């Protein structure tokens, strides 16, 4: 939703310097989502 | 009414008028989703346009009046 590319430290100051608990939250989001909850609508794009 | 577009021109007076106003009306029905008046009978919107024009219900005048009144009331209720 932007022309931007934000990935790192700037985020650290806007929100929270923490960086690799963000990675743990990546694992979280996969678990929230991947386990068949919303996978089915992705899998129609798996053939892409 | 299906194979024959005859009565619609002795009502109005023109092929061009009936075609235009019908495309208008059944565009407000195809994508707008307003209801019919004469029964439906499982046929695409074209027939219902022709039929509604054939009995003396819809015309460019009456379309103008309906859209006028609803839009004026819309401007009113907005304030």
């Amino acid at each position: 939703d932007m022309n931007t590319d934000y990935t790192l430290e700037e985020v650290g100051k806007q929100f929270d310097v923490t960086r690799e608990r963000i990675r743990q939250i990546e694992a979280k989001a996969l678990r929230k989502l991947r386990h068949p909850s919303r996978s089915e609508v992705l899998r129609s794009f798996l053939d892409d | 009414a299906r194979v024959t577009v005859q009565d619609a021109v002795e009502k109005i007076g023109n092929r061009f008028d009936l075609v235009l106003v019908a495309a208008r009306r059944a565009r407000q029905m195809q994508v707008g989703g307003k209801d019919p008046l004469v029964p439906e009978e499982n046929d695409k919107t074209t027939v219902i346009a022709l039929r509604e024009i054939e009995e003396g219900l819809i015309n460019n005048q009456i379309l103008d009046v309906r859209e006028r009144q609803e839009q004026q009331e819309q401007e009113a209720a907005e304030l």
Partner: protein
């Protein structure tokens, strides 16, 4: 897959969806016409003969 519903739907849509008709030379105005569809089990358009 060719589901039967494909064809059920297709008959459903094709209803009242008029169509054009062209031979060449379209010399005068009546060298093309516009008819209603009807479907057939073949690769051969039929038409009303008199025209």
């Amino acid at each position: 897959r060719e589901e039967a519903v494909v064809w059920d739907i297709l008959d459903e849509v094709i209803r009242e969806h008029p169509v054009l008709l062209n031979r060449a030379p379209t010399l005068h105005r009546l060298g093309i016409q516009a008819f209603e569809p009807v479907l057939i089990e073949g690769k051969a358009i039929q038409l009303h003969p008199l025209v």
